[PDB]
């Protein structure tokens, strides 16, 4: 029942300092080695470093002396500081313990929720939501295809639902692509019965939390 | 640092079959300190095996690890639908700890041709001064498909972007979006917009196209 | 210099890979060579005389000192007396005509033992079970840690040894005193330890349990062991 | 490979219907065949008369600095304690065993030899579950007991002490001998000039700083006195 | 896991009484001797005195008469009182335990975070930030030195960064000096390539939290 | 009270080498009640050794103490980068408890002469009625350096303050700032402002100067 | 670790009922005999009575059947009621336990902080502060005496300091005397060098909290 709660600022410009904190909400703080990992988008994981309750640290040489890990035994918290951040530090950062202070034989699997850290000179921008309208060129037998193009937002993530989460069958929300502009873009598409067009209303619900953007775009058949 | 290689990159099998995943290390992993992790999209890694062969708390018995030194195997004895995700090996015998690049396990399915749909840019986007033309390749298998943009029969080269969904949980198919991005000016210079789709499930390459 | 008969306070929760105990935290086996009177008018006679250990009377000295519950022991509860000495204990003695022969076994083969201790040399994972490389003579007082070494039942042809280990967090010490109890040292052939070079060897370890300070820190408490050995003159063939 | 003499950490609270213990979590009986000198007017067999035996390294449990959970704040490490089993056998044949299970539905892993085709009756007495202790590190202690209905040519001795906080109590002395002769004054007769020694010495549970528990075992020494016995056939 | 939490007024005026409290968490209040130490700026440590849960005290004669230590067993707190403070009482004050009530054999290392106690009549004042401009007299073998003089602030501390924390290489921020005025002064310098003086902009970011003073001073060549 | 002396004042040694630190008492320390503390800048003291030779909970085994009566030694068997800080002895055999004045352990590196830079007052400061002139001695080793202010070749005294950085984590050097403070009136009465630097790394004293209104 | 917290109205008029409560904040309420004591100003102690958790009481006959003690086991509190109070009931009242329910062999020393109870027809009144000015008649061989007369206040207490607590050497603050009026008076004096009388300022700082009276009286030479 050991519980890790993760927080800290995810959005950074190059040269700034990443600061993350992990709280140990249940379980003995003194009984485990506390570890930081990161996972760049669509890649494997990298070990950053670790600490025990007495503050003894070991770091990955890959981070080039930019990394510091600390403990606060009074708050049962441990922290990551990564200096001089660049685009390649973009990743989900995780706090964890892989083993107790007894050693590697006593192996564990407690992870924080993770924090998306984006490093980019780009500024926060909400998406433009354009309809992908069902027509003769997007319909096939008893099936009509429609969607929303969620274009030119920063940073990740955006959440998309259809009819406030009531429409999940046939929904495909594509992974975001990073454009030359430094802005993200994706489509969300859905296939529905062609007979339901005009009778049933189809609304994509787009939420971009970093820019406080909420858009509810009605997708109607093309003229 | 120790480098881990995973084989294959993608493994295609049916539910109920045995999966064999390989992790190979550039040097001997001290004390067989090799862990296997499962990752479902949007979640932290989930430990299956530690110490090469020790099953973690609460992990089903269909998961087993074997091997030592440089050569390690994860075996999934009878694949369940939830097992068709990514698997990473981790060595902790040497500092720094290093992961392999991961293996994706996909459901082997009957060949499915894509339904190809094309969407012209919306009037609202055209007003903003940009034209996004979207070609949807929907519910196809296997993953291998080629999309080619032609504008007035002229092949496009470096103004399109591709995005592909993970294998669908219900029907075990893939979907693919191809987006052609042009200025309003360049869009209005041409009439015929076509995406040409090639796939094993199609008799010939399919062209979906519109005028304007 | 004030806490003679106590260990340094016990460390806890060292990583098996980083286990470096303090010398003063480690109880060691006690040993003494007792010189015996020369029996031999000369060393040329066809038959010579050797001292033969026949019986031993032995007990732990100062067991009632543990009825001091006022000096430095953690209160058992609010308003309560001090906590008795209790927990894991080891009571061991040997009598021989040679030094006690010992076998090495470790909790943790990777333990880094400190300067001034003699511990299993070139330990491996096998040293946590039985590694027959780890043979020692108890040939130095305050040197061989109790946690590293046991009497070797595969040797000790000329020694009689007796040990009881009682492990556990809250194990009560149970110690008997009487001047009426005797242990016979004669083997199946009716021969006791034969005192080579007119030397008798006595060995002991008497870890009584853990003392608990008001802080909760724990220290091993040990007590002296008395030996009274009855010896007889045994005729032997002159080996020279 | 670093924690020789320890089990894998104990799982807890598996459903009786879904109980799949990890191979390295299960202590097994130890056994060895000791070859004897070849002897062959009348044919000769080695007869086991006495055994001297003790558990080796009992003082290793006085290491309370390596990896054991503190008893309380500022306290030493927790001693090894809890359920223990101390067993040895000496015979002229492999030890004969009877299977009994806590849970007949336990799915035992590859590399273990456990009761075959178990039923509900296997949780009490099922006379189908007969085995020879004929392989080292194969027969789990939790599945098998010495069979008092057989072992005509073996002497066996075991004590089980169960409980959360049971203290290990272990004696060493080179002055104690167990006589192996039966009522007729005949000890185990060593068939094919082979003596069989068998043991299980689970001392208790080691507790890591996390609260995880591992079985700790120790080696057993055997010294067996043998004599030449005249036999027919 | 004994936790010592230290509080009390750190800014005192001459002649006033210093009052500090130490709260004990995650440990037995009755099991330890509770001690006060102080460390004057850039000096060694002085033992002030100690108390147990029954209120038995021992004091250093070096400040005897002026010092009182007390315990509150209901709050699991102990306190230091030091009368008639002057500049020489300026120090980091630490609460601690060095041993349990069992005695000196049972030795410990629990310390409070410390209280910076400054004894001064001076008023809270934000700094003037003056440029240390790079020139012919502040260049040496292809490297130019520039900085900011952070003058006449009270109390400590001030923090300095360069180009909003983007320039850390070659930066030296000196320890503050106490001037005759009773105000502090600090210099922060950085060495850079002499060629970069035309191309790169150099700004020192000075923060003095007690006066809510934030200065971003552009340091340009003379 | 018992007086403790520590030798040397500064110990200059390389990472991986053996450090031997001395603590001597004016009289016999009862029961060898002598503790060793480490202090990193900005932190409370950290106990290494108590009772002359007992290693404290969680302290690495490279730290050991020995001695009795009046003579005590801390040994760091193999110096790690974090060990290059201050060490105090504490006697608790006699009331009052007394500390030694401390030993600094610094990283021994090759001799490095200071780079000397001089800064005139800013125009905005001079308008306000004060002249601060700053001499920077940058990236030198060892720490021992002498700065002398000369105004029109007259040696100054009583009107300068000095500040020194901790040993740099990258290059193991020291830096020093010296600030000469005069009134605007006194500043404008003179022409030549010079700081003269003496250091082991220099063959002769180095002067950096300016003429007022350059 | 038994902790006794005492409260109740201290200021009473003759014939009224004294009502005090003691709360047992740590320790077993059922395990001790709970006792009330009082100590009149400058006198020894009087035992009032006691109770156990079952409500069995014993009282001092000296209180003339005016006294009631009760227990509230739900609140872990015990209370004193003294009826028909007069001037002679003026005292510090203490709650305590002297022994456990096991009996007098199991003797204890747990006391409340105490409550000052004043019984008087007098009404709350702040003092007049008059200087005791240093003169030829208050000077002897290089030592001068000066002071403040703090006259006609009710009830106790008053506090006096000199130069805001900076002057403590040579200070004597006398115990209060109860006048025939039923109002209190005290004097505070200090002896100083005669040379300081022209140069140095002497202010007595009188605080009478019950009337919210704060006086800072400058005492100058006559
Ligand atoms: Cl699963
Ligand atoms: Cl050895
Ligand atoms: Cl079977």
Numbering used by the authors:
A (entry chain D): 1 to 223
B (entry chain E): 1 to 212
C (entry chain K): 36 to 275
D (entry chain F): 36 to 75, 81 to 273
E (entry chain G), G (entry chain M): 1 to 222
F (entry chain J): 1 to 214
Structure paper excerpt:
BK polyomavirus (BKPyV) is a polyomavirus with a double-stranded, circular DNA genome of approximately 5,000 base pairs. VP1 is the only protein exposed at the outer surface of the capsid. Four major serotypes (I, II, III, and IV) of BKPyV VP1 are distinguished, each engaging sialylated glycans in the cell membrane for cell entry. Antibody mAb 319C07 (USAN potravitug) neutralizes all four BK polyomavirus serotypes and recognizes an epitope critical for viral cell attachment. mAb 319C07 is in clinical development for the treatment of BKPyV infection in renal transplant patients (NCT05769582).
The structure reveals the binding of five Fab fragments of 319C07 to the five protomers of the VP1 pentamer on the capsid outside-facing surface of the pentamer. An extensive network of interactions is formed between the VP1 pentamer and complementarity-determining regions (CDRs) of heavy (CDR H1 and CDR H3) and light (CDR L1 and CDR L2) chain of mAb 319C07. Notably, by forming contacts to VP1 amino acid residues D75cw, F76cw, G132, H139ccw, N273, S274, S275, and T277, the CDR3 of the heavy chain wedges itself into the binding pocket for ganglioside GD3 as reported by Neu et al.. This mode of binding may explain how mab319C07 prevents virus cell entry and suggests that viral escape by mutation may be highly unlikely. The structure also offers a rational why potency on serotype III is reduced: in the structure, side chain of K69 on VP1 forms a polar interaction with T57 of the light chain of mAb 319C07, which would not be possible with the H69 side chain present in serotype III. Structural crystallographic analyses further support this by identifying an epitope stretched over three VP1 protomers, where the antibody’s CDR H3 loop extends directly into sialylated glycan-binding sites on the viral capsid with the light chain making additional contacts to the BC loop.
